[PDB]
Design a protein around this nucleic acid. Sequence first.
DNA 1: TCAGAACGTCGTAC
DNA 2: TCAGAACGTCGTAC
DNA 3: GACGTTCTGA
DNA 4: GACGTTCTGA
Lengths: 157, 158
Amino acid sequence: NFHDQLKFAWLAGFVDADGCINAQIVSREDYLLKYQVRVSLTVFQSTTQHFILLDIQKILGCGTVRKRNDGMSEFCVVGGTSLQTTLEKLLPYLQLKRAQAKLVLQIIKKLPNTKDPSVLMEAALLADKVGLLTDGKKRTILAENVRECLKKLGHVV
Amino acid sequence: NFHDQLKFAWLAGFVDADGCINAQIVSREDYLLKYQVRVSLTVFQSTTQHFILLDIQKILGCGTVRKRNDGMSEFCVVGGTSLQTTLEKLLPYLQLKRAQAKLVLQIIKKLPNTKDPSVLMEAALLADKVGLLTDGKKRTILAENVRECLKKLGHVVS
DNA sequence: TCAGAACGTCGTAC
DNA sequence: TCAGAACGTCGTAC
DNA sequence: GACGTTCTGA
DNA sequence: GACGTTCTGA
Ligand SMILES: [Mn+2]
Ligand SMILES: [Mn+2]
Ligand SMILES: [Mn+2]
């Protein structure tokens, strides 16, 4: 479709401006390795224009829409399966966050093998590099925290 | 052609998200009617990605790029001639600010006749309606201020 | 007299 | 054990 | 925008 | 994001 491509180009613009493509290290207490590398695309817009997020969901065919308790609404695609598809669709039109996407795509390749501490460690190191591209200030959970935990768990990386 | 349409669709997204399509009432002390109705599209981005605003300028073929003194940069197209061409390219793809664009396009029609006080008043009333679509809290120059000034100046309007 | 170029900063929607 | 769905809020880039 | 956290269930 | 103001020149 030249029509679907018109949609994605518009969405890339929106994402480039009011979106977030991210990899984070999230604490998971019942993981044997204690950490997940979570990947996501998020789109933010005031709840006053909530509908646009649903329109984005319709365009992509996946993802969730929620309302935050502060007047904001969010669209999120989280997880390797749905996200890889989403990013491949936007990849040709992204101008500001293409690096974030290329990196996340590198992480998604490793995700099915994150039970191996070495692979997890690589995913985590890649997450850190995505953090360096975002506006974020509160990034506390880092690759070093994974490496110190893994070592404490008796693993070798 | 289609490549251009992809560029415009993307720009519309970027405008829908981090842009501003607006109409304002600006005081002009040396105007006969004391006021102008200024129409504009603006794109905002941190100076860290200053390059993208230059990219937009290249895409549209007009408009200015400046750096503000707070780490922000802006791309701006101000004025009827450049703006109308600009809005018409984005208009099919705008999804959040199409109303602002359509209203500004109504205002652009009137601008070559804003020497007439009643036409200025129409554009000023229309600008007021664009201000209702924006997120601004700071707008203090409204249609009512033009109406009172024009009356003071000896003109007849309503 | 016009009016864009360029500017400086508040409030909140990212 | 996994990990998305849904959530709550800080700092600033709109 | 971009984090960290809690809920839910495969 | 979206204002109101100052510089510049047609
Ligand atoms: Mn932005
Ligand atoms: Mn926005
Ligand atoms: Mn924004």
